[PDB]
Amino acid sequence: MPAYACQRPTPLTHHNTGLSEALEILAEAAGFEGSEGRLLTFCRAASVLKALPSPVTTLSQLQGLPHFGEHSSRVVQELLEHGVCEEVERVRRSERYQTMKLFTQIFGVGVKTADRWYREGLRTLDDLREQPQKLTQQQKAGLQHHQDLSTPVLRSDVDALQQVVEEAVGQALPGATVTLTGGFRRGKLQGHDVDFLITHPKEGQEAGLLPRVMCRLQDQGLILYHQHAFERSFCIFRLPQPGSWKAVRVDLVVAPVSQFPFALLAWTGSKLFQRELRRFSRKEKGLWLNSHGLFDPEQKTFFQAASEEDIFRHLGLEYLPPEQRNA
DNA sequence: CGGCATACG
DNA sequence: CGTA
DNA sequence: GCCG
């Protein structure tokens, strides 16, 4: 078992679901406390279990696995022996965990804002609604639409959205393309949002595109919230439903075609997969990876990729299709 | 011990 | 600060 | 919290 998540296939569904979920609770709780390092270790341990070919049944099966030391091994031991880990259950029912989870789930609220509200005594969404002067416009939208945004987006919903985005994109710049990215590209059947990547085959034509797309979607009555020269948009869309509609989060990113492989890689995820890939690139290969390119800081050159396959090859990694990037 | 991904709105 |  |  390699130490980096980008060195091993991780399927969406696997054989250690309960164990990985427990470790991910501890990872989330570590993030609520500001402990990025412990969040990373618990996430990495969870992801190792997702990559295994069969269920862990005995503690000895953790020996030699990366990211399993005394703490994560103890968690697994207790789940195997008793079906429950006392530390995990203590987190799950703690007021701090439940409130931070509730607040950070709001679009426009991160850990720092959630923690400040917690320390001020706030505990519920109605507590926030009663003092709307303290909310940004983004947070007001997140709070108004919170119920709809809490319901999973269905893969059945995604086709209809992609069609309306393509219509606006085609009027804004004929020949521009729309690619589904994020979790749905990795094979997920549900999601918290829909992520799209937009480009054009002629380098440079994509400049200035996203404002033109957003204006056209807003004119068609489809935008419930957006932030407005930009290249990323984090929107709330009106999605039709039988006799009505629902609010859905939609992310749009524009990239030049020269950067498209890097952008596709970066926005397909998973989040942990990309963090691990960027860490691998920098620490093992001495190359700096981001959503725009791959930089050799010694030669001061960028690697010209024509595909995701090119990028894996330049990093000396076996190619993983999106469905195996579910770290 | 240092390090933990990266950038745009 | 928020977001991906 | 764990790796190197």
Ligand SMILES: O=c1ccn([C@@H]2O[C@H](COP(=O)(O)NP(=O)(O)OP(=O)(O)O)[C@@H](O)[C@H]2O)c(=O)[nH]1
């Ligand atoms: O912090 C982040 C968040 C997101 N991303 C990148 O942006 C992609 C989309 O970010 P996302 O927040 O839409 N997550 P996704 O994997 O689509 O699952 P879901 O919760 O169902 O929407 C992720 O899969 C990563 O590739 C990052 O690189 N860093």
Ligand SMILES: [Cl-]
């Ligand atoms: Cl990214």
Ligand SMILES: [Mg+2]
């Ligand atoms: Mg998504």
Ligand SMILES: [Mg+2]
């Ligand atoms: Mg998204």
Ligand code: NA
């Ligand atoms: Na949030």
